[PDB]
């Protein structure tokens, strides 16, 4: 019996009466791990940097800093982790297709986000903005928001952003209910923007993480999901 990481439920906008294209999708531990993790950074179109993008067997993320520079961060295999992806596209990389429920223009990204789940207990599930295309490439274009981290690493926001509100902000003695927050391509938390697709990022929010709890809500700008789970942060101390 496969480990059930958790289940995603679509919060339908239509108000009608409630599979890969259905309204609920469970996430199950995979036979062989398919998760990726950060790896080599390239700062100019070196042949290896070019390999990272054209090789359709290598994940990579391209940060367009300038007309003269895009930075190619590779991601390599992570045997400890399973990766799942949500979005508008119906291609093989999307594990859960998602449509505009408001009823060919859409504000939902073709590769909305990825959810990465540990393969060993507590099976904690983390959420990241944007997913990999059929080339295994993620692109953050010139106009989107990016920055260098304290670690001097690349990070950025999608255009419309991935928006998450947990039931709780944490599990401490000052713990509070959770508020709507923004998650980056790398899973760090930021306060909401002033407008939805505004160029300026919110302020960094320390302490709170992208660890999904039982009852976490994921807003993908035109689709809203509910994460339900028997494992992970919500249940293990």
């Amino acid at each position: 019996a496969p480990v059930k990481y958790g289940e995603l439920i679509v919060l339908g906008y239509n108000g009608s009466l409630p599979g890969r294209r259905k309204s609920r999708f469970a996430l199950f531990k995979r036979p062989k791990a398919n998760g990726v993790k950060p790896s080599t950074v390239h700062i100019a179109c070196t042949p290896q940097a070019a390999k990272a993008i054209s090789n359709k067997d290598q994940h990579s993320i391209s940060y367009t800093l300038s007309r003269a520079q895009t930075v190619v961060v590779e991601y390599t295999h992570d045997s400890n982790t399973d990766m799942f992806q949500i979005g508008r596209s119906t291609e093989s990389p999307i594990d859960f297709v998602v449509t505009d429920t408001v009823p060919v223009q859409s504000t939902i990204s073709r590769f909305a986000c990825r959810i990465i789940c540990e393969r060993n207990p507590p099976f904690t599930a983390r959420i990241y903005a944007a997913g990999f295309d059929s080339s295994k490439n993620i692109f953050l274009g010139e106009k989107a928001a990016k920055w260098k981290t304290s670690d001097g690493q690349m990070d950025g926001l999608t255009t419309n952003g991935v928006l998450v509100m947990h039931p709780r902000n944490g599990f401490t003695e000052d713990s509070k209910p959770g508020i709507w927050r923004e998650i980056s391509v790398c899973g760090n938390v930021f306060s909401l923007r002033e407008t939805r697709s505004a160029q300026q990022r919110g302020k960094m929010v320390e302490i709170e993480t992208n660890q999904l709890q039982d009852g976490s809500l994921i807003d993908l700008c035109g689709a809203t999901l509910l994460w339900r789970t028997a494992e992970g942060l919500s249940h293990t101390p």
Binding site: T90, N160, S197
Partner: peptide, 11 residues
């Protein structure tokens, strides 16, 4: 193709 469209800005 609604699936193959490009993600338009909400703003």
């Amino acid at each position: 193709a609604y699936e193959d469209s490009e993600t338009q800005p909400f703003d």
